[PDB]
């Protein structure tokens, strides 16, 4: 009986794998978005200050 | 020897035939030794979950 109950508790906690998949996907796409932001920002400022420096 | 008065032999044979092949054997057949109780506290294969 107690083994059955423990199995029930584990299979209750089951959903963490799926929500971790969720978290990883969300974080990955957010990181990519902010990386694009900084890519374009950095490079246009690079062109601008290239002109300034020359 | 009286053991050789062969006119009293049937009355010695037949009740022995009874009491040895019928009555004692029934008295035994009602004596049975049950196998000892082996309460195996370990009988659990349910499964894991599908995962």
CSV table of N, CA, C and O in Angstrom, one decimal:
chain,number,residue,atom,x,y,z
A,1,UNK,N,0.8,-1.2,0.0
A,1,UNK,CA,0.0,0.0,0.0
A,1,UNK,C,0.9,1.3,0.0
A,1,UNK,O,0.7,2.2,-0.8
A,2,UNK,N,1.9,1.3,0.9
A,2,UNK,CA,2.7,2.5,1.0
A,2,UNK,C,3.5,2.7,-0.3
A,2,UNK,O,3.7,3.8,-0.7
A,3,UNK,N,3.9,1.6,-0.9
A,3,UNK,CA,4.6,1.8,-2.2
A,3,UNK,C,3.7,2.3,-3.2
A,3,UNK,O,4.1,3.2,-4.0
A,4,UNK,N,2.5,1.9,-3.3
A,4,UNK,CA,1.5,2.5,-4.2
A,4,UNK,C,1.3,4.0,-4.0
A,4,UNK,O,1.3,4.8,-4.9
A,5,UNK,N,1.2,4.3,-2.7
A,5,UNK,CA,1.1,5.8,-2.4
A,5,UNK,C,2.3,6.6,-2.8
A,5,UNK,O,2.1,7.7,-3.4
A,6,UNK,N,3.5,6.1,-2.6
A,6,UNK,CA,4.7,6.8,-3.1
A,6,UNK,C,4.7,6.9,-4.6
A,6,UNK,O,5.0,8.0,-5.1
A,7,UNK,N,4.3,5.9,-5.3
A,7,UNK,CA,4.2,6.0,-6.8
A,7,UNK,C,3.2,7.1,-7.1
A,7,UNK,O,3.4,7.8,-8.1
A,8,UNK,N,2.1,7.1,-6.4
A,8,UNK,CA,1.1,8.2,-6.7
A,8,UNK,C,1.7,9.6,-6.5
A,8,UNK,O,1.5,10.5,-7.3
A,9,UNK,N,2.5,9.8,-5.4
A,9,UNK,CA,3.1,11.1,-5.2
A,9,UNK,C,4.0,11.4,-6.3
A,9,UNK,O,4.0,12.6,-6.8
A,10,UNK,N,4.9,10.5,-6.7
A,10,UNK,CA,5.8,10.8,-7.8
A,10,UNK,C,5.1,11.2,-9.1
A,10,UNK,O,5.4,12.2,-9.7
A,11,UNK,N,4.1,10.4,-9.5
A,11,UNK,CA,3.4,10.6,-10.7
A,11,UNK,C,2.5,11.9,-10.6
A,11,UNK,O,2.1,12.5,-11.6
A,12,UNK,N,2.3,12.3,-9.4
A,12,UNK,CA,1.7,13.7,-9.2
A,12,UNK,C,2.7,14.7,-9.5
A,12,UNK,O,2.4,15.7,-10.3
A,13,UNK,N,3.9,14.6,-9.0
A,13,UNK,CA,5.0,15.6,-9.3
A,13,UNK,C,5.4,15.6,-10.7
A,13,UNK,O,6.2,16.5,-11.1
A,14,UNK,N,5.0,14.7,-11.5
A,14,UNK,CA,5.4,14.5,-12.9
A,14,UNK,C,5.5,15.8,-13.8
A,14,UNK,O,6.4,15.8,-14.6
A,15,UNK,N,4.7,16.8,-13.5
A,15,UNK,CA,4.6,17.9,-14.5
A,15,UNK,C,5.8,18.8,-14.6
A,15,UNK,O,5.9,19.7,-15.5
A,16,UNK,N,6.8,18.6,-13.7
A,16,UNK,CA,8.0,19.5,-13.8
A,16,UNK,C,8.8,19.4,-15.0
A,16,UNK,O,9.3,20.4,-15.5
A,17,UNK,N,8.9,18.2,-15.6
A,17,UNK,CA,9.6,18.0,-16.8
A,17,UNK,C,9.1,18.9,-17.9
A,17,UNK,O,9.8,19.6,-18.6
A,18,UNK,N,7.7,18.9,-18.1
A,18,UNK,CA,7.1,19.7,-19.1
A,18,UNK,C,7.3,21.2,-18.8
A,18,UNK,O,7.6,22.0,-19.8
A,19,UNK,N,7.1,21.6,-17.6
A,19,UNK,CA,7.2,23.0,-17.4
A,19,UNK,C,8.7,23.5,-17.5
A,19,UNK,O,8.9,24.7,-17.8
A,20,UNK,N,9.6,22.6,-17.3
A,20,UNK,CA,11.0,22.9,-17.5
A,20,UNK,C,11.3,23.1,-19.0
A,20,UNK,O,12.0,24.0,-19.4
A,21,UNK,N,10.8,22.2,-19.8
A,21,UNK,CA,10.8,22.4,-21.3
A,21,UNK,C,10.3,23.8,-21.6
A,21,UNK,O,10.9,24.5,-22.4
A,22,UNK,N,9.2,24.2,-21.0
A,22,UNK,CA,8.6,25.5,-21.2
A,22,UNK,C,9.6,26.6,-20.9
A,22,UNK,O,9.8,27.5,-21.7
A,23,UNK,N,10.1,26.5,-19.7
A,23,UNK,CA,11.0,27.6,-19.2
A,23,UNK,C,12.2,27.7,-20.1
A,23,UNK,O,12.6,28.8,-20.5
A,24,UNK,N,12.8,26.5,-20.5
A,24,UNK,CA,14.0,26.6,-21.4
A,24,UNK,C,13.7,27.2,-22.7
A,24,UNK,O,14.4,28.1,-23.2
A,25,UNK,N,12.5,26.9,-23.3
A,25,UNK,CA,12.2,27.5,-24.6
A,25,UNK,C,12.0,29.0,-24.5
A,25,UNK,O,12.5,29.8,-25.3
A,26,UNK,N,11.3,29.4,-23.4
A,26,UNK,CA,11.0,30.8,-23.2
A,26,UNK,C,12.3,31.6,-23.0
A,26,UNK,O,12.6,32.6,-23.7
A,27,UNK,N,13.2,31.1,-22.1
A,27,UNK,CA,14.4,31.8,-21.9
A,27,UNK,C,15.3,31.8,-23.1
A,27,UNK,O,15.9,32.9,-23.4
A,28,UNK,N,15.3,30.8,-23.9
A,28,UNK,CA,16.2,30.7,-25.1
A,28,UNK,C,15.7,31.8,-26.1
A,28,UNK,O,16.5,32.5,-26.6
A,29,UNK,N,14.4,31.9,-26.3
A,29,UNK,CA,14.0,32.9,-27.3
A,29,UNK,C,14.1,34.3,-26.8
A,29,UNK,O,14.5,35.2,-27.6
A,30,UNK,N,13.9,34.5,-25.5
A,30,UNK,CA,14.2,35.8,-25.0
A,30,UNK,C,15.6,36.2,-25.1
A,30,UNK,O,15.9,37.4,-25.5
A,31,UNK,N,16.5,35.3,-24.8
A,31,UNK,CA,18.0,35.6,-25.0
A,31,UNK,C,18.3,35.9,-26.4
A,31,UNK,O,19.0,36.9,-26.7
A,32,UNK,N,17.7,35.2,-27.3
A,32,UNK,CA,18.0,35.5,-28.7
A,32,UNK,C,17.4,36.9,-29.1
A,32,UNK,O,18.1,37.6,-29.9
A,33,UNK,N,16.3,37.2,-28.6
A,33,UNK,CA,15.7,38.5,-29.0
A,33,UNK,C,16.6,39.7,-28.4
A,33,UNK,O,17.0,40.6,-29.2
A,34,UNK,N,17.0,39.6,-27.2
A,34,UNK,CA,17.9,40.7,-26.7
A,34,UNK,C,19.2,40.6,-27.3
A,34,UNK,O,19.9,41.7,-27.5
A,35,UNK,N,19.7,39.5,-27.8
A,35,UNK,CA,21.0,39.4,-28.5
A,35,UNK,C,20.9,40.1,-29.8
A,35,UNK,O,21.8,40.8,-30.3
A,36,UNK,N,19.7,40.0,-30.5
A,36,UNK,CA,19.5,40.7,-31.8
A,36,UNK,C,19.5,42.2,-31.5
A,36,UNK,O,20.1,43.0,-32.2
A,37,UNK,N,18.7,42.6,-30.5
A,37,UNK,CA,18.7,44.0,-30.1
A,37,UNK,C,20.1,44.6,-30.0
A,37,UNK,O,20.5,45.5,-30.6
A,38,UNK,N,20.9,43.9,-29.2
A,38,UNK,CA,22.3,44.4,-28.9
A,38,UNK,C,23.2,44.3,-30.2
A,38,UNK,O,24.0,45.1,-30.4
A,39,UNK,N,22.9,43.3,-31.0
A,39,UNK,CA,23.7,43.2,-32.2
A,39,UNK,C,23.5,44.4,-33.1
A,39,UNK,O,24.5,45.1,-33.4
A,40,UNK,N,22.3,44.7,-33.4
A,40,UNK,CA,22.1,45.9,-34.3
A,40,UNK,C,22.5,47.2,-33.6
A,40,UNK,O,23.1,48.0,-34.3
A,41,UNK,N,22.1,47.3,-32.4
A,41,UNK,CA,22.5,48.5,-31.6
A,41,UNK,C,24.0,48.8,-31.7
A,41,UNK,O,24.5,49.8,-32.1
A,42,UNK,N,24.8,47.8,-31.2
A,42,UNK,CA,26.2,47.8,-31.2
A,42,UNK,C,26.8,48.2,-32.6
A,42,UNK,O,27.6,49.0,-32.8
A,43,UNK,N,26.2,47.5,-33.7
A,43,UNK,CA,26.9,47.7,-35.0
A,43,UNK,C,26.6,49.1,-35.6
A,43,UNK,O,27.4,49.7,-36.2
A,44,UNK,N,25.3,49.6,-35.4
A,44,UNK,CA,25.1,50.9,-35.9
A,44,UNK,C,25.8,52.0,-35.2
A,44,UNK,O,26.3,52.9,-35.7
A,45,UNK,N,26.0,51.8,-33.8
A,45,UNK,CA,26.8,52.7,-33.1
A,45,UNK,C,28.3,52.6,-33.6
A,45,UNK,O,29.0,53.5,-33.6
A,46,UNK,N,28.7,51.4,-34.0
A,46,UNK,CA,30.0,51.2,-34.5
A,46,UNK,C,30.2,51.9,-35.8
A,46,UNK,O,31.3,52.6,-36.0
A,47,UNK,N,29.3,51.9,-36.7
A,47,UNK,CA,29.4,52.7,-37.9
A,47,UNK,C,29.4,54.2,-37.6
A,47,UNK,O,30.3,54.9,-38.1
A,48,UNK,N,28.6,54.6,-36.7
A,48,UNK,CA,28.5,56.0,-36.3
A,48,UNK,C,29.9,56.5,-35.8
A,48,UNK,O,30.5,57.5,-36.2
A,49,UNK,N,30.4,55.8,-34.8
A,49,UNK,CA,31.6,56.2,-34.2
A,49,UNK,C,32.9,55.9,-35.1
A,49,UNK,O,33.9,56.5,-34.9
A,50,UNK,N,32.7,55.0,-36.0
A,50,UNK,CA,33.8,54.9,-37.1
A,50,UNK,C,33.9,56.2,-37.8
A,50,UNK,O,35.0,56.8,-38.1
A,51,UNK,N,32.7,56.8,-38.3
A,51,UNK,CA,32.7,58.1,-38.9
A,51,UNK,C,33.3,59.1,-38.1
A,51,UNK,O,34.1,60.0,-38.5
A,52,UNK,N,32.9,59.2,-36.8
A,52,UNK,CA,33.4,60.2,-35.9
A,52,UNK,C,34.9,60.1,-35.7
A,52,UNK,O,35.6,61.1,-35.8
A,53,UNK,N,35.4,58.8,-35.5
A,53,UNK,CA,36.8,58.7,-35.3
A,53,UNK,C,37.6,59.1,-36.6
A,53,UNK,O,38.7,59.7,-36.4
A,54,UNK,N,37.2,58.7,-37.7
A,54,UNK,CA,37.9,59.0,-38.9
A,54,UNK,C,37.9,60.5,-39.1
A,54,UNK,O,39.0,61.1,-39.5
B,1,UNK,N,1.7,-77.2,18.6
B,1,UNK,CA,1.5,-75.8,18.2
B,1,UNK,C,0.0,-75.6,17.9
B,1,UNK,O,-0.6,-76.4,17.1
B,2,UNK,N,-0.6,-74.6,18.5
B,2,UNK,CA,-2.0,-74.2,18.1
B,2,UNK,C,-1.9,-73.4,16.8
B,2,UNK,O,-3.0,-73.3,16.1
B,3,UNK,N,-0.8,-72.7,16.5
B,3,UNK,CA,-0.7,-72.0,15.2
B,3,UNK,C,-1.0,-72.8,14.0
B,3,UNK,O,-1.1,-72.2,12.9
B,4,UNK,N,-1.1,-74.1,14.1
B,4,UNK,CA,-1.3,-75.0,13.0
B,4,UNK,C,-2.7,-75.6,12.9
B,4,UNK,O,-2.9,-76.5,12.1
B,5,UNK,N,-3.6,-75.2,13.8
B,5,UNK,CA,-5.0,-75.7,13.7
B,5,UNK,C,-5.7,-75.0,12.6
B,5,UNK,O,-6.4,-74.0,12.7
B,6,UNK,N,-5.4,-75.6,11.4
B,6,UNK,CA,-5.9,-74.9,10.2
B,6,UNK,C,-7.4,-75.1,9.9
B,6,UNK,O,-7.8,-75.5,8.8
B,7,UNK,N,-8.2,-74.8,10.9
B,7,UNK,CA,-9.6,-74.6,10.8
B,7,UNK,C,-10.0,-73.3,11.4
B,7,UNK,O,-11.2,-73.0,11.3
B,8,UNK,N,-9.1,-72.6,12.0
B,8,UNK,CA,-9.4,-71.3,12.6
B,8,UNK,C,-8.6,-70.2,11.9
B,8,UNK,O,-8.5,-69.1,12.3
B,9,UNK,N,-8.1,-70.5,10.7
B,9,UNK,CA,-7.3,-69.5,10.0
B,9,UNK,C,-8.1,-68.4,9.4
B,9,UNK,O,-7.7,-67.2,9.5
B,10,UNK,N,-9.2,-68.6,8.7
B,10,UNK,CA,-10.0,-67.5,8.1
B,10,UNK,C,-10.4,-66.5,9.1
B,10,UNK,O,-10.2,-65.3,8.9
B,11,UNK,N,-10.8,-66.9,10.3
B,11,UNK,CA,-11.2,-65.9,11.3
B,11,UNK,C,-10.0,-65.1,11.9
B,11,UNK,O,-10.2,-64.1,12.5
B,12,UNK,N,-8.8,-65.5,11.6
B,12,UNK,CA,-7.6,-64.7,11.9
B,12,UNK,C,-7.2,-63.8,10.7
B,12,UNK,O,-6.7,-62.7,10.9
B,13,UNK,N,-7.4,-64.3,9.5
B,13,UNK,CA,-7.0,-63.6,8.3
B,13,UNK,C,-7.9,-62.4,8.1
B,13,UNK,O,-7.5,-61.2,8.1
B,14,UNK,N,-9.2,-62.6,7.9
B,14,UNK,CA,-10.1,-61.6,7.3
B,14,UNK,C,-10.1,-60.3,8.2
B,14,UNK,O,-10.0,-59.2,7.6
B,15,UNK,N,-10.3,-60.4,9.5
B,15,UNK,CA,-10.3,-59.1,10.2
B,15,UNK,C,-9.0,-58.4,10.1
B,15,UNK,O,-8.9,-57.2,10.2
B,16,UNK,N,-7.9,-59.1,10.0
B,16,UNK,CA,-6.6,-58.4,9.7
B,16,UNK,C,-6.6,-57.7,8.4
B,16,UNK,O,-6.2,-56.6,8.2
B,17,UNK,N,-7.1,-58.4,7.3
B,17,UNK,CA,-7.3,-57.8,6.0
B,17,UNK,C,-8.0,-56.4,6.2
B,17,UNK,O,-7.6,-55.4,5.7
B,18,UNK,N,-9.1,-56.5,6.9
B,18,UNK,CA,-9.9,-55.2,7.1
B,18,UNK,C,-9.0,-54.2,7.8
B,18,UNK,O,-8.6,-53.2,7.3
B,19,UNK,N,-8.5,-54.5,9.0
B,19,UNK,CA,-7.9,-53.5,9.9
B,19,UNK,C,-6.6,-53.0,9.4
B,19,UNK,O,-6.0,-52.0,9.8
B,20,UNK,N,-6.0,-53.7,8.4
B,20,UNK,CA,-4.7,-53.3,7.8
B,20,UNK,C,-4.9,-52.6,6.5
B,20,UNK,O,-4.1,-51.7,6.2
B,21,UNK,N,-5.8,-53.0,5.7
B,21,UNK,CA,-5.9,-52.4,4.4
B,21,UNK,C,-7.1,-51.4,4.3
B,21,UNK,O,-7.2,-50.7,3.3
B,22,UNK,N,-8.0,-51.4,5.3
B,22,UNK,CA,-9.0,-50.4,5.3
B,22,UNK,C,-9.0,-49.5,6.5
B,22,UNK,O,-8.9,-48.3,6.3
B,23,UNK,N,-9.1,-50.0,7.7
B,23,UNK,CA,-9.3,-49.1,8.8
B,23,UNK,C,-8.1,-48.3,9.2
B,23,UNK,O,-8.2,-47.1,9.5
B,24,UNK,N,-7.0,-49.0,9.3
B,24,UNK,CA,-5.8,-48.2,9.7
B,24,UNK,C,-5.4,-47.2,8.6
B,24,UNK,O,-5.0,-46.1,8.9
B,25,UNK,N,-5.6,-47.6,7.3
B,25,UNK,CA,-5.3,-46.7,6.2
B,25,UNK,C,-6.2,-45.5,6.2
B,25,UNK,O,-5.8,-44.3,5.9
B,26,UNK,N,-7.5,-45.7,6.5
B,26,UNK,CA,-8.4,-44.5,6.7
B,26,UNK,C,-8.0,-43.7,7.9
B,26,UNK,O,-8.0,-42.5,7.8
B,27,UNK,N,-7.6,-44.3,9.0
B,27,UNK,CA,-7.1,-43.6,10.1
B,27,UNK,C,-5.9,-42.7,9.8
B,27,UNK,O,-5.7,-41.6,10.4
B,28,UNK,N,-5.1,-43.2,8.8
B,28,UNK,CA,-3.9,-42.3,8.4
B,28,UNK,C,-4.4,-41.2,7.4
B,28,UNK,O,-4.1,-40.1,7.7
B,29,UNK,N,-5.1,-41.6,6.4
B,29,UNK,CA,-5.5,-40.7,5.4
B,29,UNK,C,-6.2,-39.4,6.0
B,29,UNK,O,-6.3,-38.4,5.3
B,30,UNK,N,-6.7,-39.5,7.2
B,30,UNK,CA,-7.2,-38.3,7.9
B,30,UNK,C,-6.1,-37.6,8.6
B,30,UNK,O,-6.4,-36.6,9.3
B,31,UNK,N,-4.9,-38.0,8.6
B,31,UNK,CA,-3.7,-37.4,9.2
B,31,UNK,C,-3.0,-36.6,8.1
B,31,UNK,O,-2.3,-37.3,7.2
B,32,UNK,N,-3.0,-35.3,8.1
B,32,UNK,CA,-2.4,-34.5,7.0
B,32,UNK,C,-1.5,-33.5,7.7
B,32,UNK,O,-1.9,-32.8,8.6
B,33,UNK,N,-0.3,-33.3,7.0
B,33,UNK,CA,0.6,-32.3,7.5
B,33,UNK,C,0.7,-31.1,6.5
B,33,UNK,O,1.2,-31.2,5.4
B,34,UNK,N,0.0,-30.0,6.9
B,34,UNK,CA,0.0,-28.9,6.0
B,34,UNK,C,1.3,-28.3,5.9
B,34,UNK,O,2.2,-28.3,6.8
B,35,UNK,N,1.6,-27.8,4.7
B,35,UNK,CA,2.9,-27.1,4.4
B,35,UNK,C,3.0,-25.9,5.3
B,35,UNK,O,2.0,-25.2,5.5
B,36,UNK,N,4.2,-25.5,5.8
B,36,UNK,CA,4.4,-24.4,6.7
B,36,UNK,C,3.9,-23.1,6.1
B,36,UNK,O,4.1,-22.9,4.9
B,37,UNK,N,3.4,-22.2,6.9
B,37,UNK,CA,3.0,-20.9,6.3
B,37,UNK,C,4.3,-20.1,5.9
B,37,UNK,O,5.2,-19.9,6.8
B,38,UNK,N,4.4,-19.8,4.6
B,38,UNK,CA,5.6,-19.0,4.2
B,38,UNK,C,5.1,-17.6,3.8
B,38,UNK,O,5.1,-17.3,2.6
B,39,UNK,N,4.7,-16.7,4.7
B,39,UNK,CA,4.2,-15.4,4.4
B,39,UNK,C,5.3,-14.5,3.8
B,39,UNK,O,6.1,-13.9,4.5
B,40,UNK,N,5.4,-14.6,2.4
B,40,UNK,CA,6.5,-13.8,1.8
B,40,UNK,C,6.1,-12.3,1.8
B,40,UNK,O,5.2,-11.9,1.1
B,41,UNK,N,6.8,-11.5,2.7
B,41,UNK,CA,6.5,-10.1,2.7
B,41,UNK,C,6.9,-9.3,1.5
B,41,UNK,O,6.7,-8.1,1.4
B,42,UNK,N,7.5,-10.0,0.5
B,42,UNK,CA,8.0,-9.4,-0.7
B,42,UNK,C,7.3,-10.0,-1.9
B,42,UNK,O,7.7,-11.0,-2.5
B,43,UNK,N,6.1,-9.5,-2.2
B,43,UNK,CA,5.4,-9.8,-3.5
B,43,UNK,C,4.8,-8.5,-4.0
B,43,UNK,O,3.7,-8.2,-3.7
B,44,UNK,N,5.6,-7.7,-4.7
B,44,UNK,CA,5.2,-6.4,-5.2
B,44,UNK,C,5.9,-6.2,-6.5
B,44,UNK,O,7.1,-5.7,-6.5
B,45,UNK,N,5.3,-6.5,-7.7
B,45,UNK,CA,5.7,-6.0,-9.0
B,45,UNK,C,4.5,-5.4,-9.6
B,45,UNK,O,3.6,-6.1,-10.2
B,46,UNK,N,4.3,-4.1,-9.4
B,46,UNK,CA,3.2,-3.3,-10.0
B,46,UNK,C,3.6,-2.8,-11.4
B,46,UNK,O,3.1,-3.3,-12.4
B,47,UNK,N,4.4,-1.8,-11.4
B,47,UNK,CA,5.3,-1.4,-12.5
B,47,UNK,C,5.8,0.0,-12.1
B,47,UNK,O,5.5,0.5,-11.0
B,48,UNK,N,6.7,0.6,-12.9
B,48,UNK,CA,6.7,2.1,-12.8
B,48,UNK,C,5.5,2.6,-13.6
B,48,UNK,O,4.6,1.9,-14.0
B,49,UNK,N,5.5,3.9,-13.7
B,49,UNK,CA,4.4,4.5,-14.5
B,49,UNK,C,4.8,4.3,-16.0
B,49,UNK,O,5.9,3.8,-16.2
B,50,UNK,N,4.0,4.7,-17.0
B,50,UNK,CA,4.4,4.6,-18.4
B,50,UNK,C,5.8,5.3,-18.6
B,50,UNK,O,6.5,4.9,-19.5
B,51,UNK,N,6.0,6.4,-17.9
B,51,UNK,CA,7.4,7.0,-17.9
B,51,UNK,C,8.3,6.3,-16.9
B,51,UNK,O,7.8,5.8,-15.9
